[PDB]
Amino acid sequence: AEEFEVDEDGDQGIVRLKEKAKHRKGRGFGPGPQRSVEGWILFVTSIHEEAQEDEIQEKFCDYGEIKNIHLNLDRRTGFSKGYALVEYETHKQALAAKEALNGAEIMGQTIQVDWCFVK
């Protein structure tokens, strides 16, 4: 597809960061929301490990039409990771949910809600 833009600043930001590192090991050494293709995606964190999609779908459904919900599960334990991507149809809905749900709680635990992609 499309070749990555040249990014001198970014490339050098990585350099600084790596040269500031004082512990190394491994054979290797040898603002502003951005819309997705089919809607607006929020990123939810601090989700209880015992939570399932149903609970997420439930708490976010009142703010608009949910196009997708990814509540990924931990690959070893089977519990949910701790995060989720909730995609709404519009910016308005996504913003409303975000303002109302950031700080709310699921299964007694406080969650955080933010934009997933930015500019």
Partner: protein, 137 residues
């Protein structure tokens, strides 16, 4: 401003370059590249909370305390690289492609940890890319 994550798995040879690789740069720019054999190249900026989530997952996996010398080295069949920077620490692990194998090797616990962390990270990236662009491996 203080986090970096890079993962690569693939093979270069006479029929070309087969691989997958994603990079989360310090400013939050995600670069996703996938060579089949079909080619995918995608870029996007993720919000700071996605970055903090990755940082948390890595920290909880505790892969930063492992080391790759005991692990199977990369060969000419395949190779994988996990490169991470968190604060003062920097790791650039290397091994072959990919489970029952890890169990009878040296440091099964460490290679198992590496294995699960890679699946958890891939999972996050596939979700980000899949949903933001409507694509997939």
């Amino acid at each position: 401003e203080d986090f970096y994550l890079r993962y690569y798995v693939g093979h270069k040879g006479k029929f070309g370059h087969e691989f997958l690789e994603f990079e989360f740069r310090p400013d939050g720019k995600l670069r996703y590249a996938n060579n089949s054999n079909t080619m995918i190249r995608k870029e996007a900026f993720v919000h700071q909370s996605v970055m903090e989530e990755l940082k948390r997952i890595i920290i909880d996996s505790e892969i930063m305390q492992e080391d790759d010398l005991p692990w199977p080295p990369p060969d000419r069949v395949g190779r994988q690289e996990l490169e991470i920077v968190i604060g003062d620490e920097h790791i650039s692990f290397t091994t072959s492609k990919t489970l029952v194998d890890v169990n009878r090797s040296k440091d099964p616990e460490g290679l198992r940890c590496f294995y699960y962390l890679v699946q958890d990270l891939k999972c996050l990236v596939f979700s980000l890319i899949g949903l933001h662009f409507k694509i997939k491996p």
